[PDB]
Amino acid sequence: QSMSVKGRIYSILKQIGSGGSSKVFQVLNEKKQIYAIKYVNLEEADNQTLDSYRNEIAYLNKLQQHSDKIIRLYDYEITDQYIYMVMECGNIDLNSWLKKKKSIDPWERKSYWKNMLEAVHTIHQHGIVHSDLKPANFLIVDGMLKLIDFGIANQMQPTVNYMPPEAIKDMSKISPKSDVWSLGCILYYMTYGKTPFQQIINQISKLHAIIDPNHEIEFPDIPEKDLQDVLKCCLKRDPKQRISIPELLAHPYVQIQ
Ligand SMILES: CCOc1cc(-c2nncn2C)ccc1Nc1ncc2cc(C)nc(NCC(C)(C)C)c2n1
Question: Where in the sequence is the active site?
């Protein structure tokens, strides 16, 4: 019902999600201001998993200054038993919002796409490749999309649909082009209401369809135009032929209108 971080006291209202050892809570400080606290239990954690939480917290701190499209971290407490992270509170995650919302506005979709690109470009500049991008990694904070995690530490829950073909074939990798494919799948969902390989239920057959070059991804005609070109450029199976993020930021879809 109550917890202490550094010196400040916070009162728990409700739980948002869990990730094995991790937990996210909606809190309030002494001045009745809303915040989000991530609690990580380290009692069962090993030397490899401990260093992965140490690495993601360090990058979250450094990248605060570099972009406003990355979640805000205010303070943290790290001991041998736990981790407490005082972060900003979002309205909803992108996945929970996408499932509830039927039709999406084209001006809202265009705005969200630019936000995702800005956030993923920042981590790439610092040599980070997420490699597990999905809508749940993005948070809606006052009509703006912010990136929650960097994929260094372990994931959380409140799918193989966003996996690039090169990851499956690698059984010396990978490149920032892998995140471009995953981002493309999120945009394809915001455009057609389904992921490029959602139709296949059998996971063995679905994985074969992603790597198969003869398998043609469906691109139905829509009033937009530059949007259809982005989708075809992001969803290219060859990463060397796939579009880059600096190129995407200069594309007519992102710059014109
Ligand atoms: C006050 C409203 O709070 C939320 C309600 C919903 C939600 N609405 N319907 C369903 N859900 C889950 C979703 C998100 C938030 N805000 C939030 N803020 C800050 C957050 C920080 C972190 C590190 N992880 C969150 N979330 C984890 C998840 C993606 C795994 C959920 C965070 N979540």
Answer: 132 (proton acceptor)
